[PDB]
Ligand binder design. Sequence first.
Ligand SMILES: [N]S(=O)(=O)[C][C][C][C][C]C123[B@]45[B@]67[B@@]89[C@@]1%10B81%11B698B746B814B562B%10%1143
Ligand SMILES: [Zn+2]
Length: 257
Amino acid sequence: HWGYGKHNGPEHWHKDFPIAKGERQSPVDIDTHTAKYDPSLKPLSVSYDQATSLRILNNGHSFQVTFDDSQDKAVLKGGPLDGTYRLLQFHFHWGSLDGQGSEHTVDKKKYAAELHLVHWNTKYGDVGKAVQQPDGLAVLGIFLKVGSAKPGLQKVVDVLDSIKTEGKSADFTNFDPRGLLPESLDYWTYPGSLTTPPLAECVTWIVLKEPISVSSEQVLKFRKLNFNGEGEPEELMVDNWRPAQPLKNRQIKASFK
Ligand SMILES: [N]S(=O)(=O)[C][C][C][C][C]C123[B@]45[B@]67[B@@]89[C@@]1%10B81%11B698B746B814B562B%10%1143
Ligand SMILES: [Zn+2]
């Protein structure tokens, strides 16, 4: 039922998910001048050398690449985190035009898209249990700007024609998520939520300062996907982003000066 349209979009979500108006919702505007440099923050540890991608799926809200999270193969640790977080999946949010699409904003600037690498804390054993905990998930967010192509994204965009509509999926092995990362691991961090229903307040957000560049042709392939199932009226999967939510009683910390 929920989606991104006029009648079922983000302003409606609180009716099914009342935490939508809670105290630690995501995304937020990152006011770069108000973020506090915290010299006690550690460098982020991203260990993706043994990542095993499995499948790529159109879920009717975005597309996602799912990983084998049954062992510690692709993990996030360090930064603001305590313990080890396993990579479950990545997905994107994007716009109908290049001036919107990101969920987080930086001094009110919207990027063309935002990549989310979703990880869960191994202390809770499974993602279902982790979503019920205030430190259950760590999501690494990366902004996409339009310019030069990202070579490491191309394997992903080339299979999107095979998952056009909601419910389609395909085998998607040997995809290396290291090829989606920018040079710097400088980050902002704050406590927040899932940006899609159920909007659970379980996420340590880690948002990279450095965007990656993708080409117009790459982002145009995102915009050919459909929210609808095959046999329903065609509704392009664009503008699948939640807008910035109130910061309330939170401080955004920066790993860098
Ligand atoms: N946009 S985001 O905040 O990166 C989404 C983060 C969570 C994605 C993975 C999920 B959410 B809860 B638990 C796990 B199951 B249920 B719903 B289902 B989706 B998958
Ligand atoms: Zn997301």
